[PDB]
Amino acid sequence: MKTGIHPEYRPVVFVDTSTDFKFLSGSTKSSSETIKWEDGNEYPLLRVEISSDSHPFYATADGRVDRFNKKY
Amino acid sequence: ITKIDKNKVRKKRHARVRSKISGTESRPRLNVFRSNKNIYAQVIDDVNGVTLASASNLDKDFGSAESKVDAASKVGELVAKRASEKGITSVTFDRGGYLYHGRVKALAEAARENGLEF
Amino acid sequence: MLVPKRVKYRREFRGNMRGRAKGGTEVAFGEYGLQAVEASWITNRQIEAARIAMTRYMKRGGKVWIKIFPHKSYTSKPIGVRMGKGKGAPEGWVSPVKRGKIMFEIAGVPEDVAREALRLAAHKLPVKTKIVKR
Amino acid sequence: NRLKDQYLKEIVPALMSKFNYDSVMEVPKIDKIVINTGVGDATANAKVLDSAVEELALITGQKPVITKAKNSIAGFRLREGMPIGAKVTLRGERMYDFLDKLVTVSLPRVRDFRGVSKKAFDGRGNYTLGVREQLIFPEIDYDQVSKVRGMDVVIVTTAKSDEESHELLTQLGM
Amino acid sequence: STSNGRDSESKRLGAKRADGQFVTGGSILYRQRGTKIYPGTNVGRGGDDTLFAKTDGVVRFERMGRDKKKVSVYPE
Amino acid sequence: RVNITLECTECGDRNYITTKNKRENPERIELKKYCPRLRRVTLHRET
RNA sequence: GUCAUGGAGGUAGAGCACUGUUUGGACUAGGGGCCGGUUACCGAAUUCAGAUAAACUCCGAAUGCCAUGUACUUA
RNA sequence: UGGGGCGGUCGCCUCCUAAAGAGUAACGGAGGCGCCCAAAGGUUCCCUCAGAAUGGAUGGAAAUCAUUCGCAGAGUGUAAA
RNA sequence: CUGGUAGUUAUGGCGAGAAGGUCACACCCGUUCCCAUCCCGAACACGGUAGUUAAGCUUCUCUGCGCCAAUGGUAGUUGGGGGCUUCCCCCUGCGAGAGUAGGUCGCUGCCGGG
Ligand SMILES: [Mg+2]
Ligand SMILES: [Mg+2]
Ligand SMILES: [Mg+2]
Ligand SMILES: [Mg+2]
Ligand SMILES: [Mg+2]
Ligand SMILES: [Mg+2]
Ligand SMILES: [Mg+2]
Ligand SMILES: [Mg+2]
Ligand SMILES: [Mg+2]
Ligand SMILES: [Mg+2]
Ligand SMILES: [Mg+2]
Ligand SMILES: [Zn+2]
Description:
part of a larger assembly; 6 chains; A: mainly beta; four-stranded mixed beta sheet; 29% strand; B: alpha+beta; 4 strands; binds magnesium ion; binds zinc ion; RNA-binding; metal-binding (chain F); ribonucleoprotein (chain F)
């Protein structure tokens, strides 16, 4: 941890777009959102697409929704 | 991954400093052993291989420690007095393969402040 | 023709062949062999001539081992050349054979064939030979 | 961070039960990881290395260590002196936070993370992932990423043999 | 005709003093390339690996470990 | 690669001679060498 | 000069532990074809047995050489 | 100068010949030199090479990374010891 | 008994197996302070001991690898003498290398705690 030279880094909690899965993590992006989960150590909010919260191995707008709404 | 061997790699470093530092009858060698909790000081001459003085945290008395960094300075005060009892005045400092930064360092100034010349 | 693929030095001393053979004086692979009684240089052209004569008599039967190899080279000068001005160009390859060295070995044939195929080969070499068994 | 809340709490007792270890010190650890990319095409261009090292730093959070060449090779118009690739060797809390996003949001970003990939083991108990697409991590700038080179992710563990090495990553999620 | 014919000048290396012989300080005991023999007690090494005596005494060619050798000078 | 001389900066007498590469060291080399006349260490600059 | 003691030094011999040269087996690692073999489009490496060297050495004499002696003889 | 001429050589360094101290010739057998480095010098502190096997992406037989074996099979500005 | 620190050509090393101990020595926990990472408290340095003898370490067993090593014989050879001289033979003194019997899982000194 040599001072100054290293780039910025700060833990951030992510949420899945499919389920709003609270997922404590770390990143280097503020994402313009901050929540107060686990008060006393505030964490920013950075949303993310499909992840381990609802991963198949582990449809909302565009893709099929246009396909189903058009053809039904 | 193979776990690192802390003491064995030090023996390689201690053999490097021993190529130029040796103890004789007139000027013995002052050696230092540092562990995770204890620091040991010893005075040796290599012409015949005997110990002239020794002091450490395991001494008979004088128990007073703080951060085990000035405890070495307490050790250095005792070894300097014990070594100077028999007339030893000039010695050479053997690092023991360590650095010269903390506990090993602060041991040295304790002897220099007392009746010992490095 | 048995020749080394490459050599470190083109030119070479001639050496000497005094004393009994260093090693290989016992037949190991085959059952019969030619033992040299005298010592002399043996070229690769004499090895080939002795190899064909001994192989042909068996009608390509059995197995044949060659226990020597021409490592050493030798040079020569043309006719009409005075002495001096360097060393001659290499010409051939020899194998200094000391006394007692086994040169060829034979297996896979009856005794009468073995005792006869060896003597046809022994007439192509400049050494006095002998036939020995295991 | 939560991996500490998930490894020490329940993964540690699971290994002892499944393997019958004599003491607790035999439960395998995670020692170090490396991120080696390889930019050997930069032997002629001095602008490719600037972005890739900067991109890797944002992905991990530590300064990349610009490597060099060891031997001179004729057929690649390459010699001694120029940099070839870079690596980052993180350790500590960053060890699990990097894996925290790698096994949660980075893997689904691939076209198909469901590929088992159980043959990538070194044979002593270390797993070396080889994700080459520079889009799995949701931190790298997609538009700003000019080129696309390949990467390596190496997991080294104190697991003596493969079965307990594979077993650990299964409980950690893989 | 023929290349070659060139050679250097012999440098007269080797031992210059005998075992058990009294030597004055500063006298050369061994000339060499590299370190065929290591310096010992009261013996230094020169810029080009020559071993010389630092004080008067008797030369002793002794043996270091299994694959090494040294020379020392012991005052009488 | 040429041969150069070093000149004292107080006495002005040329005490030392060295060599340097004129393509890699186009400047005038300065070194701190012992000056016999003043019996003290003195900066020396190439003439 | 001999005797006793101590050394430095790799020749003769020998050996394959390195470097070249080299014989017969085992093993055909291989990667693309043919129909797992053929590696017949190869011996690349390891192993067994057997050789070879002025510019090879894991070894290594007899002699000769340098010293010490207060030994005996001799100029 | 194995007659002279033609050809080749003429100073310095390393190896073999050189016969186990040093020295030792031939128009004998092999190679280099007429420089370079302001750090490739001094000192203090620190650590260890080539190669192979496996795991992998651009990148294949070899580019970079990870583990294991590894007495030097590397390196030592340049010729050899 | 244990922790340091030296001498001795590995007969001392390597490999394999078992036991032991937080009295020492260790692994260990974190980086506020000192110091450090071509990055990373991995190491160097720093403050303590939640836990463990897995490792290190210390003991005990081996001949598997390695290392040491005779006796006899042979090669070679100083001196003397003969042949039919690519070389060979005899007498006296010296005398290897390879192979083998055999040996080895070390032996000694000082100091501090028990
Ligand atoms: Mg010098
Ligand atoms: Mg010089
Ligand atoms: Mg030995
Ligand atoms: Mg003698
Ligand atoms: Mg010979
Ligand atoms: Mg001689
Ligand atoms: Mg000589
Ligand atoms: Mg020339
Ligand atoms: Mg250098
Ligand atoms: Mg004998
Ligand atoms: Mg013997
Ligand atoms: Zn001046």
